[PDB]
């Protein structure tokens, strides 16, 4: 099972960034999203398509439909610069998207 | 936090053993790849595809052992932890860089 993401997104401070993750009927699965700042362990920012852990601000939001899950980050800050990975389970295998490198500049 | 292994050697990554344990590696320029998982309360280990059978998951601490290392195995190796039956991982341990040469 394959999950594809755009390799990079580059956005100015303050504007909203979307990061997509696509896979065969991905809309029928729970998708989780991870933020990995450079040189750091990943952090969970969304689970079950759209729910935020404690500590994750409401400017992170998510959706999931047809073949694509989307992570949306409004008011992008420098600290949002990171690699974002979607994940999903297919047939008792855990799959990660290839990651999207978000640049805030 | 950073180790150097010779080709053909082995590396063990250990994790603290209601939670699910998962092992993930980040190869430079290749994103995250699952290596397998382990549920302490049920002692069930799941193996990931793509490591030519050279992963072993054991517990006494749980351990992921990767044998017969090659340069393609150079990567950062993580322990991650998440709640039972929820397929996500809310705590990732510090990475361990493993440099094979």
């Amino acid at each position: 099972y394959v999950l594809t993401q755009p390799p990079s997104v580059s956005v100015a401070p303050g504007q909203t960034a979307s990061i997509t993750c696509s896979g065969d009927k991905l809309g029928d699965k729970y998708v989780s999203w991870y933020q990995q700042r450079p040189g750091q362990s990943p952090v969970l920012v969304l689970y079950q398509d759209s729910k935020r852990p404690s500590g994750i601000p409401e400017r992170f939001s998510g959706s999931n439909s047809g073949n694509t899950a989307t992570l949306t980050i409004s008011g992008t800050q420098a600290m949002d610069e990171a690699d974002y990975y979607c994940q999903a389970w297919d047939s008792s295998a855990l799959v990660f998207g290839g990651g999207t490198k978000l640049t805030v500049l | 936090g950073a180790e150097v292994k010779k080709p053909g050697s082995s590396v063990k990554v250990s994790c603290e053993a209601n939670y699910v344990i998962t092992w993930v590696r980040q190869a430079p320029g290749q994103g995250l790849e699952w290596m397998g998982g382990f549920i302490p309360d049920f002692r069930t280990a799941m193996y990931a595809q793509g490591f030519q059978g050279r992963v072993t998951i054991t517990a006494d601490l749980a351990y992921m052992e990767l044998t017969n290392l090659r340069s393609e195995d150079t990567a950062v190796y993580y322990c991650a932890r998440g709640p039972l039956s929820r397929g996500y991982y809310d705590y990732w341990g510090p990475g361990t860089l493993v440099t094979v040469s």
Binding site: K29, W89, S92 | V20, F42, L84, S85, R86, G87
Partner: peptide, 12 residues
Amino acid sequence: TGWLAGLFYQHK
């Protein structure tokens, strides 16, 4: 499948 898989993830 089964309860085994439900330990690791519960399906949408």
